[PDB]
Amino acid sequence: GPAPRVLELFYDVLSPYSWLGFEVLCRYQHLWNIKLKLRPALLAGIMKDSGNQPPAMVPHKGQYILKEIPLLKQLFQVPMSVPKDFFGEHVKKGTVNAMRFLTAVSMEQPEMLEKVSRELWMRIWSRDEDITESQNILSAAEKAGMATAQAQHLLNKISTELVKSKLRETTGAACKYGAFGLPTTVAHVDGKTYMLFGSDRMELLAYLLGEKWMGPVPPTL
C-alpha cells in the first residue's frame, strides 16, 4: 500500500507528558500507516531557545499538573507516580546524561531506543529513582535488555562531541519546527508538515492522518 507517514516524536524523560505521548504513539505504530521516529531532545534546551517560562510559575497551574497526572496515568495506562519533589530534585538535577545516552542509543542501537527510553521513565517517573548517575542509567539500559558491555560502551560516549552535538542538533530541529515545550510531534503527510504539542493532540493527529482514533489504549491487532 501507500508509504507510511513519518512521525517524529521529540521527548525528554524528564517530562511526564512526554511519556504519555510516547506510549500512545508506540501503541499506534502497529495500527496506523506510520513510521515512528523517536527524537531524544532536552526540554531545558527547548525552553531555552523558545524563550518559554516555567509552567509552574503559576501556583494553580503547577498544582493542577500534579493533580492531573494521577488521573491521566489511569486513562493512558502508564504506571507513573508524582515524585516526592519533582520541581525540586529531578528537574534541577537535570537529564543531560540520560538524554545524551538515549542519543547514543538512537545512533548505535536504534532497536533499543524504545525500551531504554521506557526504563529511564520507569525510574524517574514510576519509582522516583535517580537517572543522573552512570550506574543508574546503566541499570535502566540493562532492564531494557541491553547487554552490560554494550550499555557501558555507549555510556562511555555520552561525553563525546558526536553525541553531544547530535543531542543539540535534535533539540534544535524541534525548535526550528516551532517547538516551545515537550512532547512535540511532527507529522509529515502528503507534502504537509504538522507540529502538535502535548500528549492530548493524538486524537487531532489521527484526524489529520485519516486514521481511526481509539483512545490512548487502542486494541491490539
Annotated binding site for glutathione: 15-17, 52, 182, 199-200
Q: How many angstroms separate the CA atoms of 10 and 170, rounded?
A: 8
Q: How many CB atoms lie within 10 A of CB 161?
A: 8
Q: How many angstroms separate the CA atoms of 175 and 13, rounded?
A: 18
Report the residue from 172, 198, 211, 218 that binds ligand GSH according to the rule CB under 6 A: 198
Which does residue 51 bind out of ligand GSH, a second copy, none, counting CB within 5 to 8 angstroms by kind? a second copy
Site string for a second copy, 44-83 (x = CB under 8 A): ------xxxx---xxxxx-xx--xx--xx-xx--------
Closest CA to 5 of 37, 34, 42: 34
Q: How many angstroms separate the CA atoms of 109 and 115, rounded?
A: 11
Per CB under 6 A, which of residues 118..137 are in contact with ligand GSH? none
The region of 33-41, 78-86, 90-98, 174-182 touching ligand GSH under the rule CB under 6 A is: 174-182
What residues contact 31, with CB distance under 8 A and at least 6 apart? Answer: 211, 218, 221
Kindly state the smallest distance separating residue 195's Cβ from a second copy, in Å: 7
Q: 80 is written with which cell numbers?
A: 507513573
Site string for ligand GSH, 50-89 (x = CB under 6 A): --x--x-----x----------------------------
The region of 26-34, 83-91, 166-174, 177-185 touching ligand GSH under the rule CB under 6 A is: 177-185
Half-sphere exposure of 155 toward its Cβ, with a 13 Å CA cutoff? 21
